[PDB]
């Protein structure tokens, strides 16, 4: 499963979304090895990663290796596959001497064109909010199509800090035009961080992204993605 | 008026402990996060340690523990930095700054206060 | 910690000129990055976060770029009360760490 993914050809038949682009998640000189069940692949800024062989709405870890060949950081790296979007994650262990970080990689899919929006309806997407150690958060986020505004919130994280609303914000176009929403993050009414979506799919389906949380000792990420139901 | 308004110049003598303040006008003291800096000779700058007024949640820069001790006080909107056990290479300008983006946390800061330790 | 390191430390540059500052970290630092401007006797004021966000109210000729490791601000257009010494500042990992800073000067 994680194995195929690292192996198989893509499989026009398999569950969307069927690849993802790693650009953020391996830089420019860099390797990234992906491990699992016995098999490695290495990617490759730029390289596809095969999704179409992991399951929808899950997070599927591999052991990672980041090079540039050199070891810099190992340790886990996360995925999370919905039908238009995923995004992928580190968590960092060792650098060897134990050092943990949690990081956002790419947030990637189909995005929603904001010029080819729903003119109208109230949307409510169910799904994951995931941070170090932790992928039982839930996210529920609802966009009026109307108002062309989106809020939310994330409950059911272990860490109290990270059960955030995710104010009300405008759609805005990114530099591409694809529809994204950013916002503010609030813990107890009051602003601690920041968040971003963007929008998926031809009929605004899915959103994906992340919140950044600020605290005294740094700024946390949960990676965010959720779906019509 | 400005809102990070600090404490006047310290002279002290070394073994001495000092406690800066950094009272808050203009804005939600409670809100928003409170952090000191060091910069020695008017150059080198360096992060002391970073307080949340609301919550008392604190964090030091590991070569600051056991120098520096930050607190608040909510009622007077007022931060406090005390420096312990002090020497010649406490001598230095600090400041308070204060976070106001939600993806940053050193955004207005204070007008400085000039400690200089001597015998 | 994270070390972060400013090149040049002095630069000359006449008015009306486009100036642009580097700073580089010793590992990827997600676009966590202040820099601030110091004038003589001043307190630092704060120019950029998160890399590229001017602050409210910076001139437009200002903006903060780069990823990873490796991060800029340019001056479009240098004017007089741009002189002064700019640090960068990482905040990725805590303990935030600041560059040793770039003193921008007058060319006469």
């Known amino acids: 499963g994680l194995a195929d993914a690292l192996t198989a050809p893509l499989d026009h038949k398999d569950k969307g979304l069927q690849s993802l682009t790693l650009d953020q998640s391996v830089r420019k000189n860099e390797k990234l090895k992906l491990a699992a069940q016995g098999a490695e692949k290495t990617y490759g800024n730029g390289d596809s990663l095969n999704t179409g062989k992991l399951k929808n709405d899950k997070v599927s870890r591999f052991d990672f290796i980041r090079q540039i060949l050199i070891t810099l950081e190992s340790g886990e790296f996360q995925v999370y596959k919905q039908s238009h979007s995923a995004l992928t994650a580190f968590q960092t262990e060792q650098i060897m001497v134990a050092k943990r970080q949690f990081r956002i990689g790419d947030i990637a899919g189909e995005h929603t064109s904001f010029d080819k929006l729903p003119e109208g309806g109230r949307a409510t997407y169910r799904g994951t909010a995931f941070g170090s150690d932790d992928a039982g958060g839930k996210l529920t986020y609802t966009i009026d199509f109307a108002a062309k505004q989106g809020n939310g919130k994330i409950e059911h994280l272990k860490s109290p800090e990270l059960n955030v609303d995710l104010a009300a914000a405008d759609i805005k176009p990114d530099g591409k035009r694809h529809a994204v929403i950013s916002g503010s993050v609030l813990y107890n009414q009051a602003e601690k961080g920041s968040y971003s979506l963007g929008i998926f799919g031809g009929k605004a389906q899915e959103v994906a992204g992340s919140a950044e949380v600020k605290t005294v000792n740094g700024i946390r990420h949960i990676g965010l993605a959720a779906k019509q139901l | 008026q400005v809102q990070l308004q600090e404490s006047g110049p310290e002279l002290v003598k070394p073994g001495a402990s000092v406690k800066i303040s950094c009272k808050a006008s203009?804005?939600?003291?409670?809100?928003?996060?409170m952090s000191w800096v060091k910069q020695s000779n008017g150059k080198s700058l360096e992060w002391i340690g970073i307080?949340?007024?609301?919550?008392?949640?604190?964090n030091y820069n590991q070569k600051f523990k056991g120098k520096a001790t930050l607190t608040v006080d909510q009622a007077s909107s007022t931060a406090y930095m005390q420096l312990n056990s002090l020497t010649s290479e406490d001598s230095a300008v600090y400041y308070c700054?204060?976070?106001?983006?939600?993806?940053?946390?050193?955004?207005?800061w204070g007008q400085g206060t000039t400690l200089t330790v001597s015998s | 910690d994270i070390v972060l390191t400013q090149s040049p430390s002095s630069i000359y540059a006449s008015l009306g000129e486009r100036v642009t500052l580097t700073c580089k970290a010793s590992?990827?630092?997600?676009?966590?990055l202040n820099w601030f401007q110091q004038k003589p006797g001043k307190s630092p004021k704060t120019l950029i976060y998160?890399?590229?966000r001017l602050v409210d109210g910076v001139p437009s000729r200002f903006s903060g770029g780069g990823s990873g490791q490796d991060y800029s601000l340019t001056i479009s257009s240098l004017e007089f009360e741009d002189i002064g010494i700019y640090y960068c500042?990482?905040?990725?990992?805590?303990?935030?760490?600041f560059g040793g800073g770039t003193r921008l000067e007058i060319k006469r």
């Open positions: 203009g804005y939600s003291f409670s809100d928003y996060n």
């Open positions: 307080i949340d007024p609301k919550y008392g949640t604190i």
């Open positions: 590992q990827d630092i997600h676009n966590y």
């Open positions: 700054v204060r976070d106001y983006y939600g993806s940053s946390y050193f955004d207005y």
């Open positions: 500042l990482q905040y990725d990992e805590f303990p935030p760490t």
């Open positions: 998160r890399a590229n």
